[PDB]
Point group: D2
Chain length 121, copies 4
């Protein structure tokens, strides 16, 4: 639960359930204008991913949360439209914050929103 | 062919198609403050309904468009969450020209958006 | 947090924040085919509503969660398109369950999903 | 006027309008496995982009459509969450005829859906 700075929440709109065991890769745009592996995980039984980074580690930058939606759907036996879902944003530019990226998935569609709260600094 | 100040567009998020043959019933709130039938139809092959009304019969007021989402997934043999999808809006043409009411459906969710324009 | 059977979560897509102090009215379709007041609330600072009903009270039926979106937007100074958001579903027909109705709001749009988990019975 | 096997539709959820003058850059994944520019344009007045390609140039493959969402809200002086919206899909016409890629935007969220059809 909020304490970490980057939390991801994935729901399944076909089943009306959390999207479980969904793979998520996080990237930081390097100095060279290339994406650099930052963190990864799988969502739990509640479709959340926590413990990705820490505050000292999560500096300002452009990150990409890539969610592997193709894999989750294939595995439930659907051939979905998308390759994956990718969310690109600028984090911590006017100070550190807490970020929640939620993705609501369906086979030919996905919505996605962000909740940003001010820790304090 | 006849001013369509009101249009509905329904789409299927599972299959990536228009949702066709969806029952849409529209209602005008009456002073007695109940709903009164107003226009009805089934979405075409492109998941659209048109010729619902005309600009003379469409006066300001509270309208409710109701989509029979449940029969839609049933026919597909997929178990739905909702009984139907509903949109309640105030039509205030003191500006507003055309109204497109779109809904994206999934077994457990639905989005809806309005496209209100002039041309 | 899950323990109650009907929980509502409302997010603001314009601000990227929980939709706070949002009024929610819950109805049960009577025997007579009329909606009967069932419960009401306001969402908290985290855009959730809990403690609406109890398990013994929430029998099978058709309920309507009506969210007063017009009021929240007006108050932030927008004239939104919708009158309110209303969610109609059949609850507890093949046994009791836990229901989470989330609504993601914008001025001319709203998405909404349901998470249903099996308590046990 | 020319087969448009690919179409993008952008809409604004704050204002209830098409999103016009949105930059859309499409890309074809190359074996070198990088993206290669493929088609580009700005949405019209109805928030649509067409004449992106033709059925001969559109072969199976991994495509990415990228929407410059951020400049869009900027021009409106509303602070955005995302740098842009992206859709990666495999175009496998061994069936598929037309592709409509729609995106509904808000300052902190976006939905996207695909409408894949035959007619
Ligand atoms: C009128 C039209 O262009 N018909 C198109 C497809 C289409 C694009 C966007 C849209 O609107 C819309 C899009 C999304 N979305 O995610 O892209 C969405 O979530 C909603 N919605 O929730 O109501 C509506 C509705 C329909 C077709 O050729 O079938
Ligand atoms: C559990 C949790 O993370 N709480 C978060 C916010 C949050 C994320 C996703 C979500 O689900 C959701 C997401 C979308 N979406 O588009 O991303 C959506 O459209 C809907 N919806 O329509 O109900 C729900 C609901 C709520 C918080 O910090 O309070």
């Amino acid at each position: 639960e909020s304490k970490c700075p980057l939390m991801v929440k994935v729901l399944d709109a076909v089943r009306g359930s959390p999207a479980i065991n969904v793979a998520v890769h996080v990237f930081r745009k390097a100095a060279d204008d290339t994406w650099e592996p930052f963190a990864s995980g799988k969502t739990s039984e509640s479709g959340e991913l926590h413990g990705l980074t820490t505050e000292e580690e999560f500096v300002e930058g452009i990150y990409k949360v890539e969610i592997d939606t193709k894999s989750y759907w294939k595995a439930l036996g659907i051939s979905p439209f998308h390759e994956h879902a990718e969310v690109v944003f600028t984090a911590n530019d006017s100070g550190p914050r807490r970020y929640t990226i939620a993705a609501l998935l369906s086979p030919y569609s996905y919505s996605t929103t962000a909740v940003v709260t001010n820790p304090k600094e």
